[PDB]
Amino acid sequence: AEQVAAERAARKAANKEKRAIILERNAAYQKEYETAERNIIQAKRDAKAAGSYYVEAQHKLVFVVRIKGINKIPPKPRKVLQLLRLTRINSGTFVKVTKATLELLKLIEPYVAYGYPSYSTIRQLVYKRGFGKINKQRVPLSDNAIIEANLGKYGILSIDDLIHEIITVGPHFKQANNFLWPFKLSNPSGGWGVPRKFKHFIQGGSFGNREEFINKLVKSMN
Amino acid sequence: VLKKNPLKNKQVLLRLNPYAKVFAAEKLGSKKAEKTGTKPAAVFTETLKHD
Amino acid sequence: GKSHGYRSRTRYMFQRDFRKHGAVHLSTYLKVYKVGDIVDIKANGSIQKGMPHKFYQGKTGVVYNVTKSSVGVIINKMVGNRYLEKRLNLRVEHIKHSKCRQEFLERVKANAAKRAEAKAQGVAVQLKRQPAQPRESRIVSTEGNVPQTLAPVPYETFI
Amino acid sequence: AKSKNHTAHNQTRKAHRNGIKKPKTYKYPSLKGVDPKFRRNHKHALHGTAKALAAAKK
Amino acid sequence: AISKNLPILKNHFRKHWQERVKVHFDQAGKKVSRRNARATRAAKIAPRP
Amino acid sequence: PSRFTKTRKHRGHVSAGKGRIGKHRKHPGGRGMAGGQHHHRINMDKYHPGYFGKVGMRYFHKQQAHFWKPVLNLDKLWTLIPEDKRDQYLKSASKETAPVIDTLAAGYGKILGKGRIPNVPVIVKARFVSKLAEEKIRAAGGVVELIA
Amino acid sequence: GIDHTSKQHKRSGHRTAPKSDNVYLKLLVKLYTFLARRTDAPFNKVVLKALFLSKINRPPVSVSRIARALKQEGAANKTVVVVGTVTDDARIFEFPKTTVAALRFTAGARAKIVKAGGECITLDQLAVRAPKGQNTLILRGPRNSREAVRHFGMGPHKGKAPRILSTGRKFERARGRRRSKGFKV
RNA sequence: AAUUGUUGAAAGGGAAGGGCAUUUGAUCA
RNA sequence: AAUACUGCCAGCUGGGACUGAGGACUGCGACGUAAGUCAAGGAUGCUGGCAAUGGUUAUAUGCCGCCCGUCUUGAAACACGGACCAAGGAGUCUAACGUCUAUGCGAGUGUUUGGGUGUAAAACCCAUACGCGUAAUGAAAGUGAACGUAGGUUGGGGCCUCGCAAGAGGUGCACAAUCGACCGAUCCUGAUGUCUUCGGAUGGAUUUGAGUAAGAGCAUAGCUGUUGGGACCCGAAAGAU
RNA sequence: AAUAUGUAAGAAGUCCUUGUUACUUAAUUGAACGUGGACAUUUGAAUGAAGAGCUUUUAGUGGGCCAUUUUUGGUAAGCAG
RNA sequence: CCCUGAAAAUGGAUGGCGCUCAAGCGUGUUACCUAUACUCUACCGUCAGGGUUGAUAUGAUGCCCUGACGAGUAGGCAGGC
Known about the structure:
This is part of a larger assembly, with 7 protein chains of 7 kinds.
Chain B: H1 10-16, H2 19-26, H3 42-49
Chain C: E1 38-40, E2 60-67, E3 70-79, E4 82-90, E5 96-97, H1 99-119, E6 138-141
Antiparallel strand pairs in C: 1-2, 1-5, 2-3, 3-4
Chain F: H1 6-10, H2 41-46, E1 71-73, H3 83-91, E2 100-102, H4 103-106, E3 110-112, E4 123-126, E5 128-129, H5 131-140, E6 143-146
Parallel strand pairs in F: 1-3, 2-4, 3-5, 4-6
The structure holds 4 RNA strands.
Subcellular location (chain G): Cytoplasm
Keywords (chain G): Cytoplasm, Isopeptide bond, Methylation, Ribonucleoprotein, Ribosomal protein, Ubl conjugation
Family (chain G): Belongs to the eukaryotic ribosomal protein eL18 family.
């Protein structure tokens, strides 16, 4: 019984090959991100310069957090919240923007705050409070092996791949979002910034759509 | 047995993202953009301050 | 006392439409009804034989029986905390076809046609429908469309 | 000594505690309420096709 | 008095039945006494059966 | 029994498992079968239909001896014969020598046709026989003897 | 707090380990638990689950039923497995050779199998011969054939064996069962 | 045990009694 | 050009509080060409003091704190009982049962009505009868369940074969619905024969049953529920001898 | 109008050929049940699901009140509905 | 905004003390304190998903791993003195 070293060496070789593929894919994703951001910036610049206005495409991904307790909730909004996986206060989920999802959010707007997330806050959320759902259990994600095992059928095998699927909605965004447990955030470190949370954002509260302002609140709560 | 947080433990960050070493080496977090310059059209310039 | 009859509180329900009284157009009697077809129920006031009840007005059901001039409809009625099936025989007059099922057969035929044509080469059939996706990027040109400045109007006391 | 007559409060919650269930559907539905002549001819046709299938494939 | 899906039972205990309860606690004693009486009779009646 | 009785666990609870709004009073619905057409009519119609009313005529002094007609189906016909000879008479299927069963002596007064008895000669004696049973026995090759 | 969508701390609703205190039954349950845990054949898991069934959930299986099951195509050379008791049927006359494994065997059924040419083995022997349940066929008796299930679900227009003690005339045959005395059921 | 008398200890601006934590007094491995 | 504002850093670093769970190695990573090392699936090293910390109780301090049990939508109430302690005190038993569970036997099942025996109300043994089930339907007379591999079809665990796997084919116990076959009652039609009025073969039903369709039952014990009994305990104004 | 509400968004499906009937049609003309045969990436809108379905037993319950909105009787009511 | 309209019976209520470029009134911006609320950790119990007869070694109703939850009258079940 001396083959333990042979299996050890084979495991190391396989791990090194896997790490090489992961590094190549991560470099490709970073290059794509930089290219896309620069392309949008220059497109806005040329539209401004050519006597025109650049109408940005509507954001396809939003982050929704629950800012209301589980008491005094009407049954239809309560059911919508359960279907959207918001059963604890200060719980957040990612949502792909469609007509059905927009009408769903319009119903439980009074009890949630949602807005367009950014790559930095998405990465921070996934790194810090990123938890998976394996065998109906909340197993923390501290290695790419678990992610590859539970998501390799969809072409996702690393935490960076999962973050990429979250930020850019693709063919397997539904499964990528379903694999992730809803993020249990804490109260904001710097406070909510308003005297009354249960008022609309235009009316001076946390209730309602915050658009790009959701990033600051999410990072404060995370 | 215990969850260690990325972005605070360099070993765990490097284990999760092998590209982190290359990112730190190339300083991709602070990259200077191309020094291109375009001038807005007179129509937009006047519409900005048209009262 | 109290009154809850077979035609109670149907004054505006079992009533013919404005300028649509008289006999029934000879098109309903020419419709062919088969077992399994989905039909809607709409009572007609001119014919008082085989009229449906108030609850079954506007409900949609499958056809399970064919008779001389009548068809049987299975309607799921919610009583208590369960749905119970109800087999009710109604005349042809107070029953019309449902276009949602016809749209479903049309979509199925187009679905199969696309499954044949696209898969003849085998690339991105995408046979499934999608909701209203967010609009992509667009560029607007102010060539003859200079934005006009708008300001709120003063309050007026017109009578 | 008068008392409350009728109220529908909490009835919806009571009915929804045990979720309202759609009736269980089967491939072969009940053949009751169907035209007796059609049922008789269906029985005859079923016997005929069963005999034909038994004679053809064994 | 009347309840869910249970059978109908006809219990005939409505008079002063508590005063007329006969419990045969002396089954073994009666058997022993009968055997002793049989032996005594057999001895008395001579070898006759 | 007493140790496993729920009263011991109910000790301490004020109502002792009988409720507070409605206490465990005496018979509130009546004694015995009080009410079968007034207030318990719903249960008496949905669980015990047919309790109230008369059905047939009257048979005074009905002795349960004239109706003593025990039944015995055809499948359980060879069980009356002892096992030690049952196999022998099963393999010996000849008309000149066949096993004989006395159903009256066995305690059965009527024989019914059900079981598809094996095609062997046999003799059966019974007070009453059925048409199907007799036809099956004669088709097998046996005969039915009428005894009293 | 959590707006629970389901009952908290709810049991699975299935019976784990037998409720009986039969030492041999517990030993057999332990053996089949070991098998089903360290093997991959679903037969071991099915047998282990059936071992927890109650008396009413474990109806007897007759030798006639065994013969009928073995009469199927390709089932002649198969090992019959009955999780329960195997009874003897006198309505059958020809019993083919087989191999039946069951917990308890009726004396008449065992004699019938021995005379036919088969053998009566236990679940432990069945496991020893076929650890993965190869070439086996599981037989279960009729569960809804009990006399206590006829009375279940009694209601109007159902005909579900009303709970009675005596049978005959003037015993729940009056008004409520005939159209001449009012309504029929 | 309820109740009562002495000895020894403590508290007592129109009640006593309890919980959250500690100082002080008595006692304790 | 600089600056204000917003967003990013897989940029660095200063200060403070809580926590030390796990117990020879197993995995994922980094540094190091390589030995080996590491902040890498949960804290170690060094040093100081004592051999006081801490547990129980009384008082004191800061805050909080309405009287136990019942009725009630609403109790602390100016609603009800309680001055205290000690002793007793309230869902028990019988007969027939319903669901479930356990045991034994099993188309059979139950010794203890009784007899023999007995270390003597203990324990052991036993023949015929009898209770329930194996056949039910009609008021009754009466009759009485395989055209079939005990039917056809769907869903169906398991098993077998092919298949690297996945998947494909066959058989498919149990169970769900439906269509069929047979038995009893009712409505009908009516084959030979004949004590001319008896006999009821064969073919059907939008009819009907607490049926058959390879039996599942019997005995005892246990939780809970119902009935009758005084019936969880206590209490009437009354009636009769 | 808004709100509220029913049905459909597929393998129990679609399509090709043809076996049965005592139904029906002038009629292999229609209806039902079928046999054989073709369509598994993307099984036919989005989301979710400590899994879903089914059976038995039974304790307690059958005097309610209050809050936003709609609203009846009453001038109003911590009034009744 | 303030003033007259504006009067009820024991002595009293923005809680009172009190407050006048307010400590009163409307609005705009930061910092500060806290719920048995939220995030993490330590322990207990319950449930779910599993590993552990290759042993001397016993309690596989035993041991261990991971995840989630823990209110409550009448009432039910289970484990214990």
